[PDB]
Ligand SMILES: NC(=O)c1ccc[n+]([C@@H]2O[C@H](COP(=O)([O-])OP(=O)(O)OC[C@H]3O[C@@H](n4cnc5c(N)ncnc54)[C@H](OP(=O)(O)O)[C@@H]3O)[C@H](O)[C@H]2O)c1
Ligand SMILES: NC(=O)c1ccc[n+]([C@@H]2O[C@H](COP(=O)([O-])OP(=O)(O)OC[C@H]3O[C@@H](n4cnc5c(N)ncnc54)[C@H](OP(=O)(O)O)[C@@H]3O)[C@H](O)[C@H]2O)c1
């Protein structure tokens with residue numbers, strides 16, 4: 001079983017919290033299915049470029065291609081979707097990036113995107129949403145949005161703990177719930193599917209710990225812990241409580257008058273981070289209406305997904321939203337959208353998303369220089385309204401660049 | 415125990431599917447907590463008015479006040495929140511309307527709004543969202559939105575089947591799941607809260623049956639069954655399947671090419687209703703972006719809540735959104751927002767919501783005449799931009815009417 005590791009580079013090492021990043025590291029990349037094949041090459045080009053421009057030849061990346069999804073079955077024999085070589089390599093190599101993956105209906109396989117995340121314990125799904133100036137938006141003021149969404153990745157209904165309607169198993173479960181648990185509340189027990197939803201002190205606390213720290217480090221204004229927690233009192237309602245607990249405990253939360261909101265004092269800055277909560281259904285409105293009062297946000301798995309895609313449409317770029325799956329031993333950055341099964345190979349989709357994800361990646365390695373070079377190029381291209389189809393078609397005379405040509409525009413604006 | 419039933423009217427009867435509505439019916443109303451006290455009187459005024467104007471004195475309503483929430487404890491002794499007199503009366507009287515209710519933290523009581531709905535088996539939460547012309551909206555084209563949200567009310571995580579983190583009970587459940595069910599997937603079993611999520615053939619099918627029928631009767635264009643069903647395969651993924659099944663089965667769905675979408679032929683009209691699906695997280699974007707392609711929509715409990723409040727902010731009026739809880743033996747219309755615990759008694763909040771809900775109510779009784787009178791008055795007031803605070807404060811010189819005065823403006827525009 002083999003992936004040709006490049007003879008040109010050196011592994012990144014995690015020397016106790018410190019990510020030791022060499023000058024020529026091996027960073028693995030999973031290509032993708034559909035436009036993964038378009039998108040990815042645009043990414044490598046702009047990344048390699050940002051690296052040349054910034055460090056004037058000193059540093060560079062030995063990209064190692066790994067396999068997952070469609071390609072895995074082709075390379076490893078169709079029956080293999082997520083081989084382990086891939087799981088080790090991400091762990092071992094420390095930082096990895098990926099294009100879009102598809103999960104095959106038919107053979108009882110759960111979401112490949114979620115399989116990677118759960119398996120590698122990448123419990124922090126980091127999703128930042130902000131308005132690049134000149135991006136055609138459906139809302140009046142897309143510029144008021146600049147949020148950093150911290151979504152729990154290892155729990156919630158998203159785990160995959162469910163028994164099919166009428167299976168002997170679901171059947172056994174209902175017998176348990178009613179017979180033993182006293183659940184006189186499942187409305188129609190016959191042919192009823194059951195899903196399970198967990199929330200631990202551990203899972204929520206480790207997530208919030210991460211979120212507040214991001215706030216302190218980047219001097220953010222607040223941390224909003226969202227939860228549909230007045231109905232789900234012991235899962236979501238406990239998300240809120242443990243989060244507040246943590247802010248008080250580990251960070252020194254002072255009460256803002258009669259509660260429940262806290263105050264965390266930013267050591268490095270003197271400013272005080274407001275720790276507050278907002279119920280999920282009411283939050284979905286608050287973000288269209290008073291979006292300038294939210295900054296960093298902590299969520300469970302389900303709401304995090306919903307809030308990311310909701311916030312990403314208002315600021316236009318559903319096609320340019322970046323994402324990171326972060327855990328303790330490694331990290332996996334990714335493209336947050338499909339490949340569009342009709343567009344593959346046509347060199348037509350917006351390659352923004354994967355590009356910003358590499359931007360996030362490059363920043364995480366400590367190459368802050370190549371990072372803002374990429375983001376500046378991005379704004380350059382967009383502002384010059386010489387953009388890709390998805391944007392071009394809502395713009396008053398934008399030049400229509402293809403995927404690759406767009407990557408180029410980014411290099412031209414660095 | 416007593417509610418003074420009015421000597422002035424006659425009960426509505428449900429004579430087998432046909433709602434026999436007298437000329438002077440007794441329609442019960444639950445006032446509300448906080449602005450329930452503002453809002454409600456505005457409603458009764460405009461309703462009584464619509465009824466005078468339309469039927470020229472012939473018909474009228476003997477309003478019977480019932481009790482739930484804060485008021486219940488006052489009238490019935492504080493310890494009683496949802497007395498049964500109230501539960502019978504709604505059933506017996508057939509149609510009831512309500513203001514906002516609050517649920518007390520502290521005494522282990524679940525949501526009063528959800529208690530009523532579950533208890534009376536009002537399994538259809540009907541939530542229509544459309545743009546009244548002149549309502550200050552945060553999106554560029556709030557006018558493209560005209561959806562009728564059919565949300566499942568008796569199932570989903572919303573049932574209240576959960577065991578607190580660390581309780582002996584949750585503890586027993588985890589032992590079951592891992593020991594007996596082979597669930598090597600609850601990430602941190604220690605101090606983990608567990609919620610339960612069911613979905614029956616029965617619950618989803620009865621909901622979709624209702625939704626499509628609404629489409630046929632009102633000549634709607636399509637029925638979008640939404641579901642986060644590629645991760646929740648046996649609850650949400652089964653919502654989708656059973657729904658399609660129903661459309662094929664009971665309504666005669668023909669396939670649109672290679673699937674999965676169907677075609678239901680509107681008997682009364684010749685037009686063909688498209689039955690399609692959209693995954694939940696992708697739907698939350700599609701509604702900001704291509705909102706004109708969605709019409710009627712079927713949902714489970716959780717997504718229905720999220721989609722209602724999401725759609726209601728884009729079309730501005732989060733404060734004017736109406737709602738209906740419909741079941742087989744009775745129906746309960748309601749105000750879909752809070753009372754704002756700082757605004758109560760100040761005669762300041764927008765009374766739209768409760769007013770439209772009575773509009774919906776009046777329509778359901780068969781008084782289609784009083785119904786569009788109210789909605790025409792509504793548009794009149796708003797268009798004349800002589801509106802309430804919440805609207806007035808985003809309008810270029812609107813006259814600032816108080817709650818009551820606004821009710822009046824509605825009567826002035828009929
Ligand atoms: N993180 C991920 O890798 C990820 C996440 C979710 C789903 N997927 C997958 O991708 C698949 C493809 O099918 P779908 O079409 O149903 O996917 P989808 O991702 O929901 O599609 C979103 C659509 O919006 C537009 N948009 C978003 N990405 C764009 C881009 N790169 N360039 C231009 N405009 C963009 C395109 O509109 P048009 O289609 O109209 O051009 C695009 O196809 C499956 O849905 C799913 O397995 C992958
Ligand atoms: N269907 C229901 O009866 C229902 C549903 C949900 C919650 N509630 C309850 O109501 C409570 C009150 O607290 P909350 O303030 O947190 O409630 P909330 O309903 O989330 O508050 C929404 C806020 O948006 C604005 N808005 C919505 N209703 C309005 C109206 N009638 N007039 C003018 N603008 C309007 C007001 O802004 P400002 O507050 O800034 O003025 C309003 O208070 C509890 O949240 C909850 O138990 C009742």
Ligand SMILES: [Mg+2]
Pocket residue numbers: 305306309695
């Ligand atoms: Mg998602």
Ligand SMILES: [Mg+2]
Pocket residue numbers: 281719720723
């Ligand atoms: Mg709601």
